[PDB]
Amino acid sequence: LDNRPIGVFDSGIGGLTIVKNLMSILPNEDIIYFGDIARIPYGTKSRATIQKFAAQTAKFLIDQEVKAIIIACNTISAIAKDIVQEIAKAIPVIDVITAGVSLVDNLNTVGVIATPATINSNAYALQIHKKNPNIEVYSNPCGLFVSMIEEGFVSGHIVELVAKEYLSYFHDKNIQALILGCTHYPIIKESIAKILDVKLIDPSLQASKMLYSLLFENKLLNTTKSNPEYRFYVTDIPLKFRSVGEMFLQTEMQHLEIVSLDSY
Amino acid sequence: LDNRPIGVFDSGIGGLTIVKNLMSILPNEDIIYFGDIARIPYGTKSRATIQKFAAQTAKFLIDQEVKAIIIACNTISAIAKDIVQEIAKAIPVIDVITAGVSLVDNLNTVGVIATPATINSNAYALQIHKKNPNIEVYSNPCGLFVSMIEEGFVSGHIVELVAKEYLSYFHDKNIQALILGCTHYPIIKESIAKILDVKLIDPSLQASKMLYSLLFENKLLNTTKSNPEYRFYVTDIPLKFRSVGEMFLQTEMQHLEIVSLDSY
Amino acid sequence: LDNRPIGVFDSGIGGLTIVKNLMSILPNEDIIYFGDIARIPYGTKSRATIQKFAAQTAKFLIDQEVKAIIIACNTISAIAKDIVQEIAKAIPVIDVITAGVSLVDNLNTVGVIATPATINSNAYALQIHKKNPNIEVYSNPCGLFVSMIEEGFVSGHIVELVAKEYLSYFHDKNIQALILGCTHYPIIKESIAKILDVKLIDPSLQASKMLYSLLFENKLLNTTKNPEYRFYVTDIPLKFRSVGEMFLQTEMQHLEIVSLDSY
Amino acid sequence: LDNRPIGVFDSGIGGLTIVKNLMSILPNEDIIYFGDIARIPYGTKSRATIQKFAAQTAKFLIDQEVKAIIIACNTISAIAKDIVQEIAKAIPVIDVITAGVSLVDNLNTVGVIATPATINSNAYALQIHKKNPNIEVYSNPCGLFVSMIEEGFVSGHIVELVAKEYLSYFHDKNIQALILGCTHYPIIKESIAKILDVKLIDPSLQASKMLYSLLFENKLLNTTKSNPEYRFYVTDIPLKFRSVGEMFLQTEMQHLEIVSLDSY
Amino acid sequence: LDNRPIGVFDSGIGGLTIVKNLMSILPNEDIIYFGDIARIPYGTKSRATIQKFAAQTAKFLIDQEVKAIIIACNTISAIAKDIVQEIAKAIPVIDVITAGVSLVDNLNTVGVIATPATINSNAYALQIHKKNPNIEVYSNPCGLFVSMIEEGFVSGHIVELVAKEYLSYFHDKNIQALILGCTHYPIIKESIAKILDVKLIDPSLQASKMLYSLLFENKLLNTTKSNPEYRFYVTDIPLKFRSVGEMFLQTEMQHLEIVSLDSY
Amino acid sequence: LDNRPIGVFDSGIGGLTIVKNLMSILPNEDIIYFGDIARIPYGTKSRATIQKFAAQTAKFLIDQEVKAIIIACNTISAIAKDIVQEIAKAIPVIDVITAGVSLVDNLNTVGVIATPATINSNAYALQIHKKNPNIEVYSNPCGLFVSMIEEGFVSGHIVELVAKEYLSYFHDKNIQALILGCTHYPIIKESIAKILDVKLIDPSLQASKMLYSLLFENKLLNTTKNPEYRFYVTDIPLKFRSVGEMFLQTEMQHLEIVSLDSY
Ligand SMILES: N[C@H](CCC(=O)O)C(=O)O
Ligand SMILES: N[C@H](CCC(=O)O)C(=O)O
Ligand SMILES: N[C@H](CCC(=O)O)C(=O)O
Ligand SMILES: N[C@H](CCC(=O)O)C(=O)O
Numbered sequence A, B, D, E: 001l002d003n004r005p006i007g008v009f010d011s012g013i014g015g016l017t018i019v020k021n022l023m024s025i026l027p028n029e030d031i032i033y034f035g036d037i038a039r040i041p042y043g044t045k046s047r048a049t050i051q052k053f054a055a056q057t058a059k060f061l062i063d064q065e066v067k068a069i070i071i072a073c074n075t076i077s078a079i080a081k082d083i084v085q086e087i088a089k090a091i092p093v094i095d096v097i098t099a100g101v102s103l104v105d106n107l108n109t110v111g112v113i114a115t116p117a118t119i120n121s122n123a124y125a126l127q128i129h130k131k132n133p134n135i136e137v138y139s140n141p142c143g144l145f146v147s148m149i150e151e152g153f154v155s156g157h158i159v160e161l162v163a164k165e166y167l168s169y170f171h172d173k174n175i176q177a178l179i180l181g182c183t184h185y186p187i188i189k190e191s192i193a194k195i196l197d198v199k200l201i202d203p204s205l206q207a208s209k210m211l212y213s214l215l216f217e218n219k220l221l222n223t224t225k226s227n228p229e230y231r232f233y234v235t236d237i238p239l240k241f242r243s244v245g246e247m248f249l250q251t252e253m254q255h256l257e258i259v260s261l262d263s264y
Numbered sequence C, F: 001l002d003n004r005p006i007g008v009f010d011s012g013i014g015g016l017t018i019v020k021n022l023m024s025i026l027p028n029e030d031i032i033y034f035g036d037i038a039r040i041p042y043g044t045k046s047r048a049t050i051q052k053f054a055a056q057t058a059k060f061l062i063d064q065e066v067k068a069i070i071i072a073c074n075t076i077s078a079i080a081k082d083i084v085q086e087i088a089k090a091i092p093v094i095d096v097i098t099a100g101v102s103l104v105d106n107l108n109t110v111g112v113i114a115t116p117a118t119i120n121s122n123a124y125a126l127q128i129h130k131k132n133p134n135i136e137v138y139s140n141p142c143g144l145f146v147s148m149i150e151e152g153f154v155s156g157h158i159v160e161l162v163a164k165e166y167l168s169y170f171h172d173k174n175i176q177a178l179i180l181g182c183t184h185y186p187i188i189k190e191s192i193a194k195i196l197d198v199k200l201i202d203p204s205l206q207a208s209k210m211l212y213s214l215l216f217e218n219k220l221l222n223t224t225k226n227p228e229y230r231f232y233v234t235d236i237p238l239k240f241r242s243v244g245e246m247f248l249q250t251e252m253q254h255l256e257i258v259s260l261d262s263y
């Protein structure tokens, strides 16, 4: 089990940051990244469809005999965590919403921004309230942010105006921190910080640390002496993928392969 | 054959305008609209994947024994028209790019805006040049427009600034007309007209008229006396679908059903 | 908390009447409707199946952090009210049977028509006799009514003949009122009236009024002045919008396909 | 292999007729019936849901090691036949639509009645036209029939009136035969014949004949001396289930066992 | 049914060994071989492409009315087995991975060599672990072997050196057997045994035995007096194809016919 | 027209060398690379198959309205140059065999190594003997080289032994130069040199220079001062970026999976 890869489970593109994080704390581990690039975005799809898609990716990863899964995507974590856990059986699953919650559960008043699917699922408020039901949670979807960022609008006047549209909801709420509850949003954190001067919470590294602690405590660390294998399995490769993905990864996606979920 | 439905073939959401158009010129015809809502957008996907998806929708429509197909989506028309035609066999296929070309092929200098997939496919320039190779064609993708419009940003300062970003390319080109080469773009035509004061070409109604002429000349008109049947078959129904779709349709999508392409 | 939605808990389709009522009497409340359209009808299924299904919907609604639940379906109310309440915990639950019973507690002879499951459960008679054992309660299931109505047979000779088959039972019972103990039956009240000349009790509005009272007493009224209406369903067949909107009497604002697989 | 059971795959209740037919045609075969009684009817559900459900049943049946399957339900046959066959790989699958089509492919004008789902799927017309594209097929849903029959309304004035409502569609069509394209409809064939007195085609018996032919010619017949075993697996045992089921089966179900499909 | 041919389904060239084995084990059976010689190798292609190709071949074979299929290729077996079985509905499909797994499920430590695609798919390890999750499986791709062998390098110093490069991975693994998980590798088994002298497992012969068992026990054996017919369908006849193919088949291909799969 | 891209037409992988060359000598030209990665290798396939495949790629490239085409692959150039030219019509086509031949036309004895298909076609000898019939041309296919190189055997004892098997043929032929008549072979030029001490002719740069000349003569040079590089391929297996980028010597900017099914 020790020398099996870690599965990084994404909807697509923004979860590459978890790969980056893992490479910084677990440099000897093999990683399989999965992105369902053919069917993104998930943030604007129904709960039934997000669950259907996540069951397929889960089965694909389990067939690769990963030793652990991290769900990098907040939208999949919000809506399909249990579907994924049920398929993974004895394979542990770490998720980014659990990570986010762990960073705010001593506050009194918390804001959350995320995809429409995530916010409409109510997952962040529910999970925060499982820790403490008296934490005040204010949530607002930021529907345009994902496409905006994928199209390269990552700073400047457009980004600032779209952010004002979505973040003005929080001005009278006296929040103590704002959860960046979508993988894409930390890219624009500097623009967010200009509009809403509060602590911004990015749960990706925390999620990676949770996976580190689990592997360490359970003695499931890779002890091979060969170069780690980083495999990027995706269901589409459109022309902009290399450039937008590597904006998140911060290094080359050197071993990239087109796969299909047709049999899953 | 006369009393079979017309198939309106979309990627999703914006092709509903063709249904509206058809209902205005062919009020006695049954219509089946197909939208692959589960996997939109197509505008940012690869050619291989767009072809794969379009073959599935084509097979679904042919199994419903439509008498004609109109491809409402510029992205599918650009990349998968031949795939669809091959599946349809003796069933005629009308497409929106053919319609657009028919509206500009006596000009000297033409601009085109469309999805990244459409513009990168080169389909509009190629098809215009098939009519006359000496027409000057200037093309620019407007990647953010589709999501922007689906998120409800349809006028105002954000729309104007995003449009300035994409349309400034045309200011020195002396174009005689600008093809609105995506179903979504006519929604924002007033904002476009503020930035680039040229004739805007919306090919949807022309495409519908092409289908009318074909049915009329071939004596394939519905002569039943019952209420026409309008069926909206979609592969997902997310929460925003009703409202955003009916913004394009301009009337209620009264008979709506979730379907699957898994067997296609 | 007062800006959280109300949850309308249905088996499917007929509970849209409760949404209509709440839109009227509580025009500034947000509402989440849940319909298990994939698995309807409930009215001809077993007790244990209805309980299993209802537990899943209850868990779904509690995950949404609704501020209150109204069980719009008589069948779920008859069979699974306790399970729903156990899942809802401190979230208040109003149900349509409690509403119906409240409208007859000054009478001495009452009839009840409902689904086969509701009648089999004997919930209406039990809940009435609990308040006053001397009230004579006569019950009769009307199995075909739900499908008949969903297929658009809502007046005319077919409806009258099916109704005569189920209602003739009441002619010699001297009832002072008939409880329409299924969401669907008020649609055909004109045909029912024709056959049985008695006061017809429709518990829908009273349930909605009880919910208003509960929100007022618990200080849970939304004070805002445009509400949002979400319709979460486990299936969307072609006929769903037409039939549903027949009960709702307006168009469904926002509709989404959801799954209970994880519940 | 030849001593494994035959699977009768139903939505619920009406498929028991095929069990009855196989008890007479193949008296030495073990039979497993499956009915998804918890979730019926299928006839009023979407294509996506019918396919989801049928995939779970098919997987349950394969796990019982059946040697052949007959899809007794027209609604599953119309919408999910390919899903079922793909799951039942090497196991042959006979369906009632194929049976029905085989009885009419010599005619010129054919009527079809079925559930809303079956008619909306266009499956009968499509499959007929695979054999002879020139046959005129007229199709009309009879939505109330399934519940009406299950509630015990099987003859008399109510049945005649409902039948008049649905069958009036055919009076001006000059059909040569009417396909009773739902398992339930043969129960009320005497009433149908009073209203529309044309040749009535019952797919269920022909499906049973096709299964015999498949087993006989392919040498898959059971010749053991152990008494045949009949098992009826259902997802619910509702109120009047035995009495309604025994209307179709015409004998008692000796082993009736509730199973859950939730693991599939 | 029993007089229909057996299909041998290959990527190309190496599968001819299975034809050779069936000529000896089942001398009275008609055989159709298919090799996609225009598009080989499959071993260095993506999962999505291997699945696309295998779906076309499978459809061609079903159209020849075969009664059973053996997937001779480990690469197709690893990646596209479910695709093939779903297309070959009722037709039973034997695969070489299943055969290989059946020969090692009594051991504790197993090595596997195969094409890059086969190893990257994890199929051998996964399938072994379905039977016994505690077996230690060590897998290494031998990418150059297929071309090397096809170019006629089948013994000698070059073969020994390349083999040393690939098999050095196993020297410290204490494996009890090595699965020769590619059709080509048994050709160089004497060289492999010089370098890594452990029990060598050849899936191809075991697959042929499993097919005999299936036909014998299921009564699908051909007993006609007409001479067996052998057909070899290929998508190309390249330069030295007969000479290379005859290395594996060990007799001449009497009917070798180019077909196109483009319609599938 | 001068802002249209150049098309680099490959079978797959090795033609990336031509992209590298053009990035160097034409730094402001946009480039579309096409590789039929799904169906490689071409070098061991039949003449008719190579022609069928090449016609599809040619049609794809013409649909993109490239301003010129360079056939980077010796195998396509040997077998399908006429088909590509017939499809390209007024779009100029440069090919690597014409380039290779141009570099030897002052010699009298020449060797050529290439794929089995290229050598079988006899294209190099035919095109050389056409210019001067007196030049002695000796040809030998090197079938294993393409796979060997793509699998990363690019130096050392294995490469030397395979090379000795194919090149020993030339020891007694008194050649003045050897044409490396396959895109892949320059990768192992150090091992080739070891065995055969003769001038090695790599036609890649000369083909790229001929394209420059053609663009200059036809007034088709892009005058702009950041170019865009698109890599269109029919498959992307795991090893593709590593092996491709070995030939390209930089990272592929923009990569897209495409299909020739409609071509
Ligand atoms: N990849 C984004 C979702 C990312 C997230 O929610 O963290 C999408 O598919 O919409
Ligand atoms: N529906 C849009 C494309 C519409 C069009 O190109 O006309 C999308 O999927 O991106
Ligand atoms: N929706 C009806 C029951 C409604 C009611 O009992 O109030 C059903 O599922 O049978
Ligand atoms: N059992 C019926 C369908 C039977 C059939 O279509 O043959 C239902 O579930 O609606």
Ligand SMILES: N[C@H](CCC(=O)O)C(=O)O
Binding pocket: E011, E012, E013, E014, E040, E041, E042, E043, E044, E072, E073, E074, E075, E076, E115, E118, E146, E181, E182, E183, E184
């Ligand atoms: N024919 C080989 C694969 C053979 C096998 O994996 O068994 C290829 O195409 O790469």
Ligand SMILES: N[C@H](CCC(=O)O)C(=O)O
Binding pocket: F011, F012, F013, F014, F040, F041, F042, F043, F044, F072, F073, F074, F075, F076, F115, F118, F146, F181, F182, F183, F184
């Ligand atoms: N790409 C090589 C041929 C390269 C060349 O001949 O220049 C192949 O497909 O075999």
